[PDB]
Symmetry: D2
Subunit: 396 residues, 4 copies
Amino acid sequence: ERVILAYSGGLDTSVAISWIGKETGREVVAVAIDLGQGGEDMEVVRQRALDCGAVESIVIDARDEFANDYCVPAIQSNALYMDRYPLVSALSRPLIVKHLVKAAREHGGTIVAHGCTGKGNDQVRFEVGFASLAPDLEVLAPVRDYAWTREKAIAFAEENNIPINVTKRSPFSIDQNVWGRAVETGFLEHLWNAPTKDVYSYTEDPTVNWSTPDEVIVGFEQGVPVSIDGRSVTPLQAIEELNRRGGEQGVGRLDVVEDRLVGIKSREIYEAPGAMVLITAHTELEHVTLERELGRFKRITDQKWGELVYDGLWFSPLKTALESFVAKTQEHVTGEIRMVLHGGHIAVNGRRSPKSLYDFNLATYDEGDTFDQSAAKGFVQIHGLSSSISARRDLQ
Amino acid sequence: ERVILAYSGGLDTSVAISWIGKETGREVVAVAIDLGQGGEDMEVVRQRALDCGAVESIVIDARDEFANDYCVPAIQSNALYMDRYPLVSALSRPLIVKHLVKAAREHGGTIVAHGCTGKGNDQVRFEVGFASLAPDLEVLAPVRDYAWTREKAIAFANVTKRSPFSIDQNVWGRAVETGFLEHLWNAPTKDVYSYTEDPTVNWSTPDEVIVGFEQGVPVSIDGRSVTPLQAIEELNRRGGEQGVGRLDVVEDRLVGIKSREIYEAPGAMVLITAHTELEHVTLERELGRFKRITDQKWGELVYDGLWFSPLKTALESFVAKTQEHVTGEIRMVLHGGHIAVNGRRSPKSLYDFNLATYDEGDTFDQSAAKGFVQIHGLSSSISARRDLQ
Amino acid sequence: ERVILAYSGGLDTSVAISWIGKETGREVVAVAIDLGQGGEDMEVVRQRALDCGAVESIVIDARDEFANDYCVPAIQSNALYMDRYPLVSALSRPLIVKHLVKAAREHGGTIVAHGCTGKGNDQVRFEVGFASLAPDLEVLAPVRDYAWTREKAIAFAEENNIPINVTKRSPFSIDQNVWGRAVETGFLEHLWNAPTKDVYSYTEDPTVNWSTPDEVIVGFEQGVPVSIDGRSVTPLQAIEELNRRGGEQGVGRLDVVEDRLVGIKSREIYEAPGAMVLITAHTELEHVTLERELGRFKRITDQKWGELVYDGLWFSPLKTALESFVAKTQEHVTGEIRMVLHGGHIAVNGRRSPKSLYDFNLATYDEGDTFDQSAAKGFVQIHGLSSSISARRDLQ
Amino acid sequence: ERVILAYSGGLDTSVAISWIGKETGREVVAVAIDLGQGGEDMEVVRQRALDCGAVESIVIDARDEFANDYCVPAIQSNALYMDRYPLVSALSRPLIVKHLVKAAREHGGTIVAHGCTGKGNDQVRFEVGFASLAPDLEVLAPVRDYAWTREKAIAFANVTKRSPFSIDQNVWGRAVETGFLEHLWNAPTKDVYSYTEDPTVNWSTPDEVIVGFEQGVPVSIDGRSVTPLQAIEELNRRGGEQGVGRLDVVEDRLVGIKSREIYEAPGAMVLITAHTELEHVTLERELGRFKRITDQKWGELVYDGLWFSPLKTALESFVAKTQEHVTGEIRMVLHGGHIAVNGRRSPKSLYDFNLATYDEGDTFDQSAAKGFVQIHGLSSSISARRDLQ
Ligand SMILES: [Cl-]
Ligand SMILES: [Cl-]
Ligand SMILES: [Cl-]
Ligand SMILES: [Cl-]
């Protein structure tokens, strides 16, 4: 009976491999997943798990899977939590859960372990995912439930001669992948404190490139990003290219006070240049290709989807049913959106679509005008009638 | 029996005064309302109506009224139609309706006239307004219903050249229509803009600004007390100097078509952005989630010409309660056409440093979390079990 | 170039056949559709159109199509307009539109005509349907737009010797099909006037069957009614059998003040015994088979669907997208609901399902109890935390 | 320092008074609240707490307060959880919390105790209530957290036999739990019922009743003025005699499970049905459509133990505005377990006979309709054209 845990090569979890081994008497399988977080080579991470006592240590390249099956759905629901940020650090959790469960089935795992705390959202996203996909697996939360701390890890590593880097942690706690980057530091827990330049990495300062804005065309086919400036791309490639081009213009710097599911507010810093460009473009394309009342209701389902995924309910039946709604709406969301990236800002300035609902002749007053204005007087009379009857009663 | 109409000194409406006089055989009262649109001196405009045959010509300074009773409600509901622009050209319409009805009561008016077309939103906002506030008044729509045009005006009759731009502006914002931009692949050029400078002009000098609210009403800038009108004006200037509030939208008109519109709303966008940030500090989670729904609905109602509808009025009662504690200051940087938030403080804050921190003062009881997650996830986990059975 | 019109054998429309012929110079094709309205034999109706000058007169049996593709979707969205009645007289309109358009393509029709007035909902349901399915067809509304009245019809019939029954119209205006019956009479336009026995037809007085209530089991498979008391049925058969059994118990008598789309309130009388039994049962089954938060949101989409269909927007993209949402939700809506029909009332008293989300062992305090109560204290603490923080601020 | 607890004279809680005394070494104050539950005389109950070691034992008559400030809000939001039952056993909880907190302030209480289990909703309604109104008070849950049972009670220690029924009732309604009905294919038998008679009993004598409201508050029955409490009581009797308000529900508990519940709520169902009918007469279309959404949300909030939440409070401000004109009378027939509506009248009616009728007085201008339909259908028709292209 194995313990399966997600592994990124850090101090606490590296030491947790042998500690879990000694605490449970079970062998540990480390699962490292490439989601485009950069940093150390995946093989170096893989080997570290082995050197720290893992019986098996595997690397999964899930970058395309993440882009295709997690980022694209977020784009299709224009997902912006608090109407501010695109679920950075929420999207990858169900993917990680799915791979941990798969590895448990393959490597005789009966227990999965995670390192989330009791005041974050990630504990919810992991544990609700495990309860939904594999309720037979026991779940261990060493940090939340067994007081597993850095200090305890270091003492255990010393006593057991675990080969691990215990040099001072920098003031920043970083969580990043190809979709975006989250930064935590003590200084920014005070709401009147502004971030400094050292907080950023994915993006340049928005004062760069004064005379060199970047005009970009992003194309979609049925709600999926498929081209940039006429060049075909995969969804992963689209995210990566727009991370670069957006980042070079300071785009996607986010500074949010958000509502955590566990009942408290917290101040967070995010960088998500490519995500914000893609969601902004996708929204502009829906304004060209989706009918009025469908769009008004879809703003409601967009919001609900974002809430469900934030709240650790990716696998919930309401989320799954909303995806069937979304899929139908995306049928004709096909076209290109032109934007200028500059000064930290995304400015739209062009649209074209073979599925456009914009009708030049209905809108124009030019010679081609086809709008029958004789209908309007009667429309306004009936549109206003029920509230006018109510007003009469009020004023009587 | 008289005809009342809104008047801004334009050619078409100036002649319409005479033409309505001949056609209906009735006297005409012109009503010019100052909403911060600039342009000609109001007294010059007032006199022109008289010279064109109006029996009465009045001027109303409604700038503070507009700011206080129309713009502030838009701020309190974070109003952004299509999630893009702050109801530029929608907010002033119910105010103008109210003043035209008042003028009708004061000057023996039995008819009100407007110059809206049959494919715009303004016809709805005016006519639903009239039907609600004063159903006894006949409504005359010479442009939509009687083929009144600049050409008919000139023929009937000081003629200025036709502008390639159709501009509608007041202190809250500016809307620009031009034929070139009816093509969606055409980008705006610099001559469309007026309220705002290009982001590149004052790039070297970013503007950090603090905006304070009291019960959801803007009341200070950088510590200086301001009226709501002064707030809008100052942030128009400071935002405009940084290119903030330039909007380019494809929107759904109520009459069933999409159209491409250009807006400038620097002050409005700073105010609505700041107000939203302050609600994230001062409103509880689930109240905030539901208020995003009512924010959206309010914006749709006002867009749709339903300012005076009973649902809009009832939402205002909801909104007023939510605003009780929306008090505090938001610090932002205006630069590059962008609004960046970087600071909040509030005497009504729901942010609790000790509950959030992992530092020594941490007060969060993590022992509650395992049980919470178990029950929070239970119903969907039961459904999953059934699915996978 | 033909004119196509829907035809049920009545006075106004019978005379309209030759009048339209004389007014437009075009030949008229009459289309009669069996939706289970009973009354005259369809062949008698068909022949009448011919005797009144139609160049072609066709009968379409659409009873199963109506049940399968219109009534079943209403059941799946629990459709109750004003939370009161199941869209009686709204559901069949898009079906009728579809068949009128089909007949136009088959019989060289360039014009479709309808007899709706300018203050009803039916004008909207017909004309928005025609604009969506066949905008190339001209639409004629003789009653609304050309002052076509009974009195004008009778005078035209006399002058042109049209063979048609012009005997006094009874005080009631009835619109019925297998899904339900709508009754209009002048007396009931006064809100303090109660209906009399003569108003009813589909249902017995609810005082009948004192000692003989009817307990019925209705089964569904993926949201579709498929059995009654263990006997397999088609959806049409289910509606018909429950019309009878419900009607014999006075079930489905409805007396509503409703909001018409054209801005006014009106008082309406409906009989819909089978529809109310099916919608009530379907709702009870969703309470057994759909998860909590999915159910809460589905009450929202149920309401929206009912509004769209009432408002003549059956063919709208929001309605079509909601159907994709609904289809996913119905995947596991499978089981049986036992109800007692009696005294005008539907009383549920039993449920069973092979897809049940009810868990006896989690609910019971009996020996089999599996609910872990140790989780509850912490759940309540966090569930209440955000509103408790807000209360503290309020009270400070 | 004292422990405060709600008390109804039951065996388990009577002994708990002593047991809490020994365990915590603290004095206990029992609080008995009259909500129309019937049963033992309140003074007898009061005395029993004293005989069991309580230092103070008080009785509160909260019947009118309950009706006025808890039941009437439920009526105004047409509250029906799962669209089935009117929050029986949910409404009284915040009232009881308020009185327990008050008693704590009056009698030096630093701890409040409740007897809720870990799988019910009541634990949430009590504990969220305490956390909101009085976070300084420690909450003790002997049944959930300290394994307190009838068996532990009897062991620790007048013992009555155990009923096969767990009953929770007050003037608003009655809830019944019994093991037999935990099986969903089992139907209730006649012994489950008490507030209501079988529909067959008084079948021969249907009861036509008129219920009047003033600003959404019930104020008359058959022309006779009544208080809200009297309204609930009279309609309990008249509805109950006709078998009205018998409910059999599978509901979603907040703690993640479904459960089967039996309710009797004759008066509540008559009142909520009538109130809904009156809103259909007095509220405009779109306001009514949106209010169905807020009705639903309010019901969920109160079910979920969030009576005191800021979203619930803000919805009450919305609701109060909507109720301004909800005034008039609704005529219904009670028979066969069913409520049939057959009459409405209102001095605030939005029904307009002349606009609706085709008779000689018809005032509806049908010339508006063709244009209305053309534009109402335009956006979806444009989308259809695109679909079919
Ligand atoms: Cl992520
Ligand atoms: Cl405006
Ligand atoms: Cl129908
Ligand atoms: Cl209660």
